[PDB]
Enzyme design. Structure first.
Site, PDB file in Angstrom:
ATOM      1  N   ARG A 117       0.842  -1.189   0.000  1.00 51.70           N
ATOM      2  CA  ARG A 117       0.000   0.000   0.000  1.00 51.70           C
ATOM      3  C   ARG A 117       0.880   1.243   0.000  1.00 51.70           C
ATOM      4  NH1 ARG A 117      -2.147   0.925   6.275  1.00 51.70           N
ATOM      5  NH2 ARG A 117      -0.032   1.039   7.164  1.00 51.70           N
ATOM      6  N   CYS A 121       3.099   5.345  -8.053  1.00 49.10           N
ATOM      7  CA  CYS A 121       3.896   6.384  -8.694  1.00 49.10           C
ATOM      8  C   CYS A 121       3.163   7.715  -8.554  1.00 49.10           C
ATOM      9  CB  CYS A 121       4.155   6.059 -10.170  1.00 49.10           C
ATOM     10  SG  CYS A 121       4.669   7.498 -11.184  1.00 49.10           S
ATOM     11  N   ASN A 155      -3.832   7.932   2.641  1.00 51.09           N
ATOM     12  CA  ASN A 155      -3.421   7.520   3.972  1.00 51.09           C
ATOM     13  C   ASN A 155      -1.918   7.500   4.098  1.00 51.09           C
ATOM     14  OD1 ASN A 155      -4.641   6.268   6.606  1.00 51.09           O
ATOM     15  ND2 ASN A 155      -2.829   5.023   6.117  1.00 51.09           N
ATOM     16  N   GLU A 156      -1.408   8.197   5.113  1.00 52.21           N
ATOM     17  CA  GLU A 156       0.029   8.213   5.420  1.00 52.21           C
ATOM     18  C   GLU A 156       0.930   8.345   4.191  1.00 52.21           C
ATOM     19  OE1 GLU A 156       0.947   4.974   8.121  1.00 52.21           O
ATOM     20  OE2 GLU A 156       0.350   6.381   9.716  1.00 52.21           O
ATOM     21  N   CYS A 161       9.101   7.742  -6.192  1.00 52.09           N
ATOM     22  CA  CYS A 161       9.192   6.964  -7.423  1.00 52.09           C
ATOM     23  C   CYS A 161      10.327   7.523  -8.266  1.00 52.09           C
ATOM     24  CB  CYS A 161       7.879   6.975  -8.205  1.00 52.09           C
ATOM     25  SG  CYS A 161       7.907   5.846  -9.638  1.00 52.09           S
ATOM     26  N   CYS A 163      10.722   6.380 -11.632  1.00 48.26           N
ATOM     27  CA  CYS A 163      10.442   5.946 -13.001  1.00 48.26           C
ATOM     28  C   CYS A 163      10.739   7.075 -13.976  1.00 48.26           C
ATOM     29  CB  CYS A 163       8.983   5.487 -13.158  1.00 48.26           C
ATOM     30  SG  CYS A 163       7.802   6.843 -13.298  1.00 48.26           S
ATOM     31  N   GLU A 320      -4.898   8.702  14.717  1.00 46.11           N
ATOM     32  CA  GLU A 320      -4.649   7.306  15.061  1.00 46.11           C
ATOM     33  C   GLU A 320      -3.831   7.124  16.338  1.00 46.11           C
ATOM     34  OE1 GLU A 320      -2.746   5.308  11.801  1.00 46.11           O
ATOM     35  OE2 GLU A 320      -4.304   5.893  10.361  1.00 46.11           O
ATOM     36  N   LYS A 369      -4.027  -8.295  11.439  1.00 44.71           N
ATOM     37  CA  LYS A 369      -5.013  -9.019  12.238  1.00 44.71           C
ATOM     38  C   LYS A 369      -4.710  -9.015  13.752  1.00 44.71           C
ATOM     39  CE  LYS A 369      -3.303 -13.876  11.917  1.00 44.71           C
ATOM     40  NZ  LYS A 369      -1.860 -13.773  11.555  1.00 44.71           N
ATOM     41  N   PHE A 370      -3.456  -8.787  14.147  1.00 48.72           N
ATOM     42  CA  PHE A 370      -3.142  -8.690  15.579  1.00 48.72           C
ATOM     43  C   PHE A 370      -2.801  -7.263  16.016  1.00 48.72           C
ATOM     44  CE2 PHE A 370      -1.792 -13.362  15.203  1.00 48.72           C
ATOM     45  CZ  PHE A 370      -3.096 -13.768  15.423  1.00 48.72           C
ATOM     46  N   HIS A 371      -3.061  -6.290  15.141  1.00 54.67           N
ATOM     47  CA  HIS A 371      -3.005  -4.891  15.548  1.00 54.67           C
ATOM     48  C   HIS A 371      -4.147  -4.631  16.511  1.00 54.67           C
ATOM     49  CE1 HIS A 371      -2.975  -0.506  15.576  1.00 54.67           C
ATOM     50  NE2 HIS A 371      -1.807  -0.540  14.959  1.00 54.67           N
TER      51      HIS A 371
HETATM   52 ZN   LIG Z   1       7.062   7.475 -11.061  1.00 57.73          ZN
END
Ligand SMILES: [Zn+2]
Ligand SMILES: [Zn+2]
Lengths: 684, 685
Positions: A117, A121, A155-156, A161, A163, A320, A369-371
């Site tokens: 996540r 780019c 998010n965050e 990148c 490229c 958060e 799942k364990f957060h």
């Molecule tokens: Zn890029």
């Protein structure tokens, strides 16, 4: 003034957090249970859709908004509000497959596959088009829904990148910066060194471990571009948000870089802040670790809070935290009974108008799942985590008067992202001991121990609003910034700087011919040598009848008009000036030439506290480990008395106050249990 | 049935010898001649030939050179020896990589490898499957009826993975089979809704990658499973002609342990692979005389792995490799001290091996393992201490043919699960460095080893009902089906022990919802509600049977139902709450140990279980710590090994009388053991 300044339409402290029904669409029983549990946890605000792109658009141009419609109406019905996220934080698989250009190329020039996540780019026209379009659909459909409170964009944000597309974007950015003058770029970066001179814009490439990484100017400007292009991607995201929903505030969630809770190093948040309506961040302190006291950690949290609060000089939003533990630390230890309440109260105390969690309900599978979450896999209310979440919620419900309140400070610490960047990249000193943000926290310590309100500011802020400005290790500084500090002192401000300050300009180009004349004149001295020490090396500085331990760095100082307040005691500069003061115009400037032990800062800053009359909002007598912090409304002070130790602590109120929860009048000595917080109102 | 022998090969003797590589010495008939003489002097009889001999067998494509191997078979036969013939897939020739680049691996980062090293072929490539199957066929055609032929050694130390597009497609087909072409099912199992990872077409799914997807646990797990399956499929492909042409010849492949702590090899699910082999064999390289543990602790670890690999097929196993001296690839390549080789070999026989086999016979003159231990050094001397101690082992083994094929039933089982190891290791949570699953199992083994109580280390592929005591620590991942089997096991009189971080997750690494699984709650009469993960300096303690015991790393907060509280925590917020519980269920009992406790706790706890269940050694011998007594049982008699794994003299006491297997002397009462001395003893039934 003290006038309240709201950041959202909510006149209550937000409570709740990331909610992800899109993982439970096949479990309507769970979805129903959520609403009841939300009511039982006294939560009212939920961040929806951060990673719901594949749930919203399972196939290109095929939309499924009904589950989301239902979530909106249901949350509205229980008296909740929605913080709606744009989903750019994780593209669907179909999108990566059909549009490979959205996959990153890392610095070693390796094209990534789909996965994870936060890793698009940032230049790709396709991903900009798609993200803006799905944002537009969301804003059209939900923009005037009474449950909507705020936009949570992506998010965050972070990462880079390299490229082809990004190379070109970088070249264009540099052309704008250096006004299409290659000579100016070459001069700024000092590319004559190692025959690196560029003779065509096409030659310039982002830094790389398999290419060029020896040019600081390139490295700094790359970080700058990464910030600007990120911010550009964000603006593109929010175009439909500003057109269709101008009434809805926009944020995005900031981070702290792991362990020392230093400011996020990947992006210049001082620049980002200007593009947001309200600051929000994600805090994951490693509570109960075995390398420091609870107090030290809390002090670090306090520092970051003072930074993100100060960015916009208005309440911030804790977007958060974990109500128990995280999933991704080396040791995923949970908050002890009382610690969650304590940590939450501390967020309110330093200016937050929210307590928001990752997460509402633990994901049944996959990476987190364990957060920690409000609701465990067991789906129980009979849970210490759920109960303590409910206790925080009940408390917040009684604290609505604190919403929108500010908390002015007479003391600022200057922090600078680009300085952090340039200093860390520099070949010099000692890599492991630069520790710039940590050093800032060391200068923050005496004020935190004395409950004196502090702003952690950037050069974008007005210096003159403060009695005391502290700028440790301002290694990179521009002539403009220098001129503003000069003005600050001349008009009456007190300025403190340290070793490794004022070496280098905004291009990471060394200042030539000695110290900049303004600094030399303000400080009445100048540094002529930085001594970099090995781990076992020590010196000491004698100051006010005491010798204080020196580690890591020392500065040989040449005296002009300045008074010598302390001297070194060993090595070839034994008995030479180590600590100086100088009257400059109406103000004063202090230089601290070596990295000294905590007690030195206590005793040194105590003098400026007395000299400049720096007081807490409300004095409370207490031992170390008890933090007192305040927020100020026009008609009262709200004061948090927080026990960040594992012992009972006796504190003393010299003035009568009212327990905010119970109404009880209180003055004199009172006992706090381990992790106990008292919140009191004092009438003005 | 009654302790009856079960022979794994045609040999009525304990195999002694090892990897033999004359293909590296074909220009030295003097060396090959000396080899045979020294084979006699070392009392070696069995040699694994051809493991990396492809390039010697087929120097160029379609051009064969079998004559040298013919002469090897005949020569070894002449001096009374046997051949374990290996298939050469362990290392393909350079011509093969060059002409058929598809056999080269693509790593996880999607880099195509160049030719080199070994054990590193693409396991999907049709070309490599065909060429290896074909040369296997030529081998079985030519040597299958040769009297020296004993067993097939298929490939060598299988391991590793490939991520090329062939393998991607094979993984996709594998996933379609597993999930019945149901993408909803796959997406549900893997929880792909998280981080918008939902797959909408099978073509989107690729293997996990450091530069792609490595955050979906179910993908990681299923990829490891596919790696195992595709490896086994490659193996089956290899052995087709071996079954056709030589059905009477047993087939094995050599297993590994994973470095330092001698944990089960993590790269392949051996509990699945074992079903495809006639006999289990493995390669032991303990770091003897290291400076971080006692000789006894290491020996215990070795015994644990032996128990595991013996138990896979509940029959004798074959030690395929160990070093008679030192290895080459360790951080500190220290050689065995005098006596230690003899001792370790005897330990191998005691825990079930019907062979002592080395890598290798003769040191390589050049390349990567030219300084690896071997029977014969570069000096070609028999005068060598290594050569002599190997000879002593040989002489000893010749007197031990009655042990061949003997088994050793245990009343105690420790349950281990490869997939559980995988999933627990991949999980984000607890503490990375303290999970230590296999090590933890060894902690529970420790008191039984210290008491010379026979132990099987089993998998869920085993009959639980055959044991009195089943120990399943940290069974983080467990299926409904395995849970039901556990339930029945306890119900019918079984005694089951579980611990912290057990039963958290199903076979998809999907969290069990709504509290602990009903069956387990009922069984144990309690449930865990919180796993406390601790920092290194953190400590707690449990009060149990009047004593305090130190706790580290993990604690479990426990909710009591029917269970009896046996021990409680003493500090932190869950102080004076239950840490150790017991519960009668049907005819059996279920114990839960909530925290990770010092050695003495397991000693005392399990001591009570040993008295309660009448758990005994095969022959009681009185001794101090570091003396291991282990036995194998024949219909007519017990064979008992008394092994001094300490560096000092050691008084040992036999209550019943027994006969020294080497001297015939009857002995009873006290016996002194010199450092590293082994006594091999026989007791008539
Ligand atoms: Zn890029
Ligand atoms: Zn492959």
């Amino acid at each position: 003034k003290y006038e309240r300044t709201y950041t959202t339409q909510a006149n209550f402290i937000l409570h709740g957090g990331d909610y992800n029904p899109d993982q439970w669409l096949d479990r309507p029983d769970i979805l129903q249970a959520d609403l009841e549990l939300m009511k039982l946890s006294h939560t009212n605000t939920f961040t929806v859709g951060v990673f719901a792109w594949s749930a919203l658009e399972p196939e290109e141009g095929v939309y499924r908004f009904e589950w989301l419609d239902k979530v909106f109406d249901d949350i509205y019905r229980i008296g909740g509000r929605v913080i709606l996220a744009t989903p750019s934080g994780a593209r669907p698989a179909w999108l990566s497959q059909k549009y490979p250009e959205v996959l990153r190329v890392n610095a070693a020039r390796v094209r990534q596959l789909h996965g994870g996540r936060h890793n698009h780019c940032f230049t790709s026209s396709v991903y900009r088009e798609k993200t803006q379009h799905i944002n537009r659909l969301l804003a059209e459909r939900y923009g005037d829904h009474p449950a909507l409170l705020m936009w949570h964009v992506s998010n965050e944000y972070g990462g880079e990148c390299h490229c082809n597309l990004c190379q070109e974007a970088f070249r264009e950015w540099l052309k704008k910066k250096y006004n299409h003058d290659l000579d100016a770029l070459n001069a700024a970066w000092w590319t004559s060194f190692w025959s690196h001179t560029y003779t065509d814009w096409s030659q310039i490439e982002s830094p790389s471990p398999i290419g060029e990484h020896t040019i600081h100017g390139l490295n700094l400007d790359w970080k700058r571009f990464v910030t600007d292009q990120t911010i550009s991607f964000f603006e593109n995201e929010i175009v439909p948000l500003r057109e269709l929903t101008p009434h809805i505030p926009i944020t995005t969630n900031f981070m702290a870089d792991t362990h020392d809770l230093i400011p996020f190093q990947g992006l210049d948040y001082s620049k980002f802040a200007k593009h947001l309506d309200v600051i929000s961040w994600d805090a994951y302190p490693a509570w109960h670790n075995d390398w420091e006291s609870t107090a030290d950690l809390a002090m670090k949290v306090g520092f970051i809070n003072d930074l993100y609060r100060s960015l916009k000089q208005q309440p911030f939003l804790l977007m958060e935290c974990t109500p128990s533990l995280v999933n991704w630390h080396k040791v995923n230890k949970a908050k002890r009974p009382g610690m969650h309440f304590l940590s939450s109260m501390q967020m309110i105390a330093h200016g937050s108008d929210s307590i928001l969690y990752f997460q509402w309900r633990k994901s049944r599978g996959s990476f987190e799942k364990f957060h920690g979450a409000v609701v465990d896999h067991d789906n129980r209310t009979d849970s210490r985590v759920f109960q303590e979440v409910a206790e925080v919620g009940k408390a917040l419900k009684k604290m609505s008067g604190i919403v929108g309140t500010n908390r002015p400070a007479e003391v600022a610490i200057l922090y600078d992202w680009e300085n952090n960047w340039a200093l860390n990249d520099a070949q010099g000193f000692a890599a492991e001991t630069k520790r710039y943000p940590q050093t800032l926290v060391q200068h923050y310590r005496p004020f935190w121990e004395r409950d004196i309100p502090v702003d952690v500011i950037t050069k974008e802020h007005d210096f003159s609003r403060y009695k005391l400005l502290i700028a440790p290790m301002l290694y990179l500084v521009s002539e403009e910034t220098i001129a503003r500090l000069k003005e600050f002192v001349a008009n009456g401000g007190t300025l403190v700087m340290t070793y490794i300050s004022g070496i280098v300009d905004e291009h990471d180009l060394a200042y030539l011919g000695g110290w900049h004349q303004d600094l030399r004149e303000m400080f009445g001295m100048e540094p002529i040598e930085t001594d970099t020490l090995y781990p076992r090396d020590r010196n000491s500085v004698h100051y006010r009848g005491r010798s204080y331990e020196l580690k890591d760095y020392a500065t040989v100082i040449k005296i002009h008009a300045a008074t010598v307040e302390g001297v070194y005691e060993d090595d070839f500069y034994a008995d030479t000036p180590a600590v100086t003061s100088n009257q400059y115009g109406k103000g004063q400037a202090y230089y601290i030439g070596g990295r000294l032990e905590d007690q030195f800062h206590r005793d040194f800053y105590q003098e400026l506290m007395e000299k400049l009359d720096l007081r807490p909002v409300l004095f409370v007598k207490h031992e170390k480990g008890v933090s007192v912090q305040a927020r100020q409304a026009p008609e009262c002070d709200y004061v948090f008395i927080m026990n960040f130790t594992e012992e009972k602590q006796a504190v003393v109120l010299e003035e009568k106050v009212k327990d905010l929860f119970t109404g009880e009048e209180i003055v004199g000595e009172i006992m706090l249990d381990k992790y106990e917080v008292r919140v009191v109102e004092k009438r003005r």
